[PDB]
RNA sequence: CUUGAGUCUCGUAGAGGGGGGUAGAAUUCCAGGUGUAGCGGUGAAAUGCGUAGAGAUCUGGAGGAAUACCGGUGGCGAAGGCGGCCCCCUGGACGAAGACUGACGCUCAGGUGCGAAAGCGUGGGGAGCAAACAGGAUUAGAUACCCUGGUAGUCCACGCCGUAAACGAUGUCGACUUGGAGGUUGUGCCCUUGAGGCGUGGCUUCCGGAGCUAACGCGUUAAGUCGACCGCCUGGGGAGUAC
């Protein structure tokens, strides 16, 4: 099997929504021998045009070994979803060694790289869980 | 464009030597392998003029080892053709 | 005497031979500027090998949404 | 126009020498041109090259301040 | 053009101002200066012209 | 036979190609709030945009085309050419090591594929610029420079004659072989010699002995030497025009 890694996409109203996702797509990986290496949130991201008229939406990240079948059908799911509004997934991508790795990225979107339109607070209950003394 | 395990195939039980992937045959079942793949890949890619160009390329080789091997006998270049499957 | 002080992918010929890569935003923001233009080698501490390598990463997580591309944002 | 700024309200110090969006700026290279694979050295050379009599003089200037034997 | 603005919002009481810009024009800190020297304090002046991704193709002025 | 040439494994860099997908930003455009008569365009303004509510500023909405920085004489392409992000497929290159085949090779008229751009048939599309067309200004004159507007075109998928400063000037292939300096890039080994060096292999730029040089210069990739094969020219106009 391959080292993979996965982005995804949902709305703010389903920013903790999205680990109920995240409990299904790691459920096809470790159904297939595959294991959970880094689970990590990029948080609210601002959008140059509205998805389903709204300006902002959520991003996610997953980083898998996995069977590279499995996660060529996850990319499929993805684009099968209309929750699920867009994805990304990249092939030979492994995850990092660090605990909470993904704090850090998180501070990066809340700072510069969004507009900022909703709470913190809700789009950090997906993901990486915010440990900051082992980040 | 290739496949390992049909590579693997052929030398299994063809081949001059030890780690010969160069005996004349295996030369021109190798290269109908990469035929075979690249085939498949023009027949949808009409306009990709690169791999059009590389499929040439293959064949014109592949023709003359088959020459090179009905210059050494010709039942046995007839034999590589039967062994490929090529042609109706 | 042996070993002296390496730079950053230096003294050695087996690291920074593949991408350098994007999922650390963290870490590509050092190597953007306020108007998120991308900074050359001399900046990023690299040679010409790794700072081809870092500008690939650098402009896939800025039109993946994960980096900052300008000043300005909507 | 006027980049931004850590300063009190600059009017009264005679910035030009940064303060551009596209007016002497580095995104003039790709704005209202074709490309160029020659053109952009080859213009440099070509604008120094017609004043000579001027470059001579400060060259010729220089060895003759060179060799501490006036 | 800046002393007939800093007329115009006088009965809105503002006095303190930050400032922004944007075009090629050279209308940049000569109106700043005529704009604060027409009783308004400004603190910051900022850029606010937009710069692209490369974008789409630019307007043409004397064939350039 | 393995040395030319061919073949796979395997290390690996890449703007190579085809099919599909995509993000943010921008050039453009509208409404309306707020605001209130201005806006726009040069050499000159006029043409053009307004006051019937613009421009400007805020916020909402709409389209179609392209990736700034990075960036290198770099890397890649069959050539034409190739630079944001994902998948899928895919041609070529480059390289530490494994070997292997056993001259299987080389050229190439004719042949076969591609071939920047302009144009255009087909279906979709019309942001930007702008042939056409429409309108404007200057000057003694102005069909132009300059300006307003803008259809086609470009662009998406498909098809059509193919041509170019396809000036990256030097036909392809092989051997022989001056030296130096620069750039790039795969990799084994190590005091990883300092810086990674060094060997080693490819690309590539310049410089340059000898050679070659009407002349510029070129110069082992010879504007060199020797061979195989193949293209072009044969004064200028008439003319790739006529037939």
Known sequence: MRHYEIVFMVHPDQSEQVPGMIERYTAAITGAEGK??????????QLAYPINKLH????????????????????????????????????????????????????????????????????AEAGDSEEEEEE | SLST???????????????????????????????????????????????????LRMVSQRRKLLDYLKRKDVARYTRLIERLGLRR | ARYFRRRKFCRFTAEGVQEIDYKDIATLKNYITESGKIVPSRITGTRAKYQRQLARAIKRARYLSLLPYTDRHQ | ??????????????????????????????????????????????????????????????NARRTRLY | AAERCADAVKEYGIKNLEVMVKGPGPGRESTIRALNAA??????????????????????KRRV
């Open chain 1, 56 to 123: 902002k939406a959520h991003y996610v990240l997953m980083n898998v070994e996995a069977p590279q079948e499995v996660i060529d059908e996850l990319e499929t799911t993805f684009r099968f979803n209309d929750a699920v509004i867009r994805s990304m997934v990249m092939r030979t991508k492994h995850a990092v060694t660090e605990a909470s790795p993904m704090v850090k990225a998180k501070d990066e979107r809340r700072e510069r790289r969004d507009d900022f339109a909703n709470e913190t607070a809700d789009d």
């Open chain 5, 39 to 60: 009783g308004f304090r400004i603190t910051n002046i900022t850029d606010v012209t937009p710069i692209p991704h490369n974008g789409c193709r630019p307007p043409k």
């Open chain 4, 1 to 62: 126009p006027v980049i931004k700024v850590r300063e009190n309200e600059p009017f009264d110090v005679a910035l030009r020498r940064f303060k551009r969006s596209c007016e002497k700026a580095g995104v003039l290279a790709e704005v209202r041109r074709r490309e160029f694979y020659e053109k952009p050295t080859t213009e440099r050379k070509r604008a120094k090259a017609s004043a000579v009599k001027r470059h001579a003089k400060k060259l010729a200037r220089e």
């Open chain 1, 36 to 45: 959970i290496h880094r689970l990590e949130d990029w948080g609210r991201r």
């Open chain 2, 5 to 55: 395990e049909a590579t693997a195939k052929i030398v299994s039980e063809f081949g001059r030597d030890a780690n010969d992937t160069g005996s004349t045959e295996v030369q021109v079942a190798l290269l109908t392998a990469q035929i075979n793949h690249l085939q498949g890949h023009f027949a949808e890619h009409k306009k990709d003029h690169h791999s059009r160009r590389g499929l």
